Design a protein. Structure first.
Length: 364
């Protein structure tokens, strides 16, 4: 009954039926809690790997609606049983691929509980039972053995990497990952008050840093932007791009917008402090040498287009504008540092030119 289509072709919805597909089920539920925190409701997400094979995902958000949907069915049943109701395949796909799923909604001092079993078949109605001092939703589900053949066991380190990433992107979000399994009991907490500023320092661990993380945010078009960067004394570039708390591994327009404004502001500043003469412009390449940067954007549903590579042409204009508006003032106020970063980029340009001449001489 709709969920049976998900059960016959799971790959078409979660990619695979291996560790990757198993862990994506966890991410679908985590995302709903993340969305809620974005909207200003809640600040805590608890992920618990249970002894029985299940996984619990709890938040302190508003809690799911308890009432009858536009249709004649309880909203909880609509969410978990109606395909793609509300990647974003929905809680209903998690239910379809679960042996059992339990919902717990904390609303106005009361706990509302609903159970699902086998293909995502309601094994109870929404029952009001228990008193509470908190607001939020808790989803516990045990993956189906027949679906995730030899792949139902949750991996702590896989989840930790993704949960730490979510905490870095949403400052003041506290994520706790708990493993209760015998012989594997562990706990980690991810809470970064300085957000993507803390992400940059993390990516630069084990490398010497040239200055403290430079951060700047703003809004251009309908896109919110967060940019953090810090140079190391090494030569590699490490540009991490994110769209709506989710990584875009192949970059896109938001990444292009950051890179173009960075080259433009650096060149303009270099000529202003007379390091470059009337003498060619520094390439992006020279400027980005040893640069670790995090580009995090928030785009409305209407504007979005592509995933892994953003296509939203307006996001180029958005990042370009925030960087071009904020970076000149950073460089002007950090006079000695910025003069040093200009010289550094000139030396990278000179090194590259000498590599080019040696290559040409070896050819001719
Ligand atoms: C079913 C519901 C009731 C819940 C509501 O979501 C909550 C979610 C919310 O509780 C919050 C984010 N949740 C949590 O905190 C949370 N925490 C945890 C641990 C979990 Cl899990 C959650 Cl959740 C939030 O606080 C409030 C504001 O919204 C949903 C959000 C948006 C819609 C208005 C949606 C709805 O009423 C829909 C419908 O009436 C129809 C269906 C039921 C007839 N529908 C459609 O459902 C299919 C046919 C689609 O199909 C696809 N995509 O293939 C479309 O259909 C189409 C044609 O696009 C989709 O239409 C847009 C809907 O999505 C809503």
């Amino acid at each position: 009954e709709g969920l049976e289509a998900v059960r016959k072709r799971p790959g078409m919805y979660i990619g695979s039926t291996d560790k990757r597909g198993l862990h994506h089920l966890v991410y679908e539920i985590v995302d709903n809690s993340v969305d809620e925190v974005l909207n200003g409701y809640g600040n805590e997400i608890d992920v618990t790997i249970n002894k029985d094979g299940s996984i619990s995902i709890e938040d302190n958000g508003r809690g799911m609606p308890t009432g009858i949907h536009k249709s004649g069915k309880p909203t909880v049943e609509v969410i978990f049983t109606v395909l793609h109701a509300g990647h974003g395949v929905g809680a209903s796909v998690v239910n379809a691929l679960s042996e059992w799923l339990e919902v717990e909604i904390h609303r106005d001092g009361n706990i509302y509980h609903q159970s699902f079993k086998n293909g995502g078949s309601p094994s109870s109605g929404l029952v009001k039972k228990g008193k509470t001092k908190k607001t939020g939703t808790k989803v516990t589900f045990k993956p189906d053995d027949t679906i995730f053949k030899a792949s139902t066991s949750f991996n702590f380190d896989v989840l930790s990497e993704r949960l730490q990433e979510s905490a870095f992107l949403l400052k003041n979000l506290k994520i706790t990952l708990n493993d209760l399994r015998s012989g594997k009991e562990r706990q980690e907490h991810y809470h970064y008050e300085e957000g993507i500023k803390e992400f940059v320092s993390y990516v630069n661990e084990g490398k010497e840093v040239l200055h403290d993380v430079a951060t700047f945010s703003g809004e251009a078009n309908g896109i919110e932007v967060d940019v953090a960067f810090q140079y190391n004394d090494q030569y590699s570039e490490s540009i991490l791009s994110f769209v709506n708390n989710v990584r875009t591994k192949d970059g896109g327009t938001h990444e292009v917008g950051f890179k173009t404004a960075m080259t433009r502001v650096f060149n303009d500043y270099a000529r202003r402090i007379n390091e470059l003469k009337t003498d060619k412009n520094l390439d992006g390449n020279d400027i980005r040498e040893g640069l670790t940067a995090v580009v995090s954007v928030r785009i409305p549903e209407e504007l979005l287009q592509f995933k892994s590579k953003l296509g939203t042409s307006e996001a180029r204009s958005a990042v370009d504008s925030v960087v071009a508006d904020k970076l000149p003032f950073y460089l002007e106020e950090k006079g000695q540092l910025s003069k040093s970063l200009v010289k550094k980029a000139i030396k990278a340009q000179q090194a590259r030119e000498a590599a080019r001449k040696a290559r040409e001489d070896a050819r001719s």
